[PDB]
Amino acid sequence: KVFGRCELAAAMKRHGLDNYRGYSLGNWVCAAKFESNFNTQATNRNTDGSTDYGILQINSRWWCNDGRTPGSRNLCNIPCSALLSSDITASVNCAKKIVSXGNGMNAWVAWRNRCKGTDVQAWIRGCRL
Ligand SMILES: O=C1C(Br)=CC(=C(c2cc(Br)c(O)c(Br)c2)c2ccccc2S(=O)(=O)O)C=C1Br
Ligand SMILES: O=C1C(Br)=CC(=C(c2cc(Br)c(O)c(Br)c2)c2ccccc2S(=O)(=O)O)C=C1Br
Ligand SMILES: [Cl-]
Numbered sequence: 001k002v003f004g005r006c007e008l009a010a011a012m013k014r015h016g017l018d019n020y021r022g023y024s025l026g027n028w029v030c031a032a033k034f035e036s037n038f039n040t041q042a043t044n045r046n047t048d049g050s051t052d053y054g055i056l057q058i059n060s061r062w063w064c065n066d067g068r069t070p071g072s073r074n075l076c077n078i079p080c081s082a083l084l085s086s087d088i089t090a091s092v093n094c095a096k097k098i099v100s101x102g103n104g105m106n107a108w109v110a111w112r113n114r115c116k117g118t119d120v121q122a123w124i125r126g127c128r129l
Helices: 005-014 025-036 080-084 089-100 109-114
Strands: 043-045 051-053
Touching: 005 025, 025 109, 051 080, 080 089
Parallel strands: none
Antiparallel strands: 043 051
């Protein structure tokens, strides 16, 4: 599923992400925009044999189990395929564990580069939340 901006903001709010770990809702929307372009089925392979899965591009070496990644730790205790669902619940629950570890939201390289240091509130502005 490809979400719209405010559509996703509302879904993330419903799952308690506003100010989770101190990160305002716009941070999470911005992260999804630049990690996956709001696409719940996004997948991207990496040189280390891992793959990043879903709306928040959750990695299969540390966080989810995809059965094919050397060194898998499965710290979210979730199969990676569940992170490709149209409903964001499993991805949000794993993201809450990631942000509590991957040194806050720096675990999301696209957020680090393309969101951090900008006025991320613009990502929720004008949404009926
Ligand atoms: O249940 C839904 C569904 Br279905 C779609 C959308 C939207 C939308 C708009 C475009 Br344009 C787009 O390309 C996509 Br995908 C979705 C949308 C609609 C009105 C205002 C803002 C948005 S937006 O801020 O969410 O974009 C909102 C909800 Br709620
Ligand atoms: O399937 C949809 C689609 Br598509 C759009 C919308 C909404 C919406 C629509 C427009 Br237009 C807009 O500019 C904005 Br912002 C939000 C909406 C979202 C959350 C709360 C209230 C509305 S409400 O405004 O519809 O009451 C709800 C459903 Br369900
Ligand atoms: Cl702006």
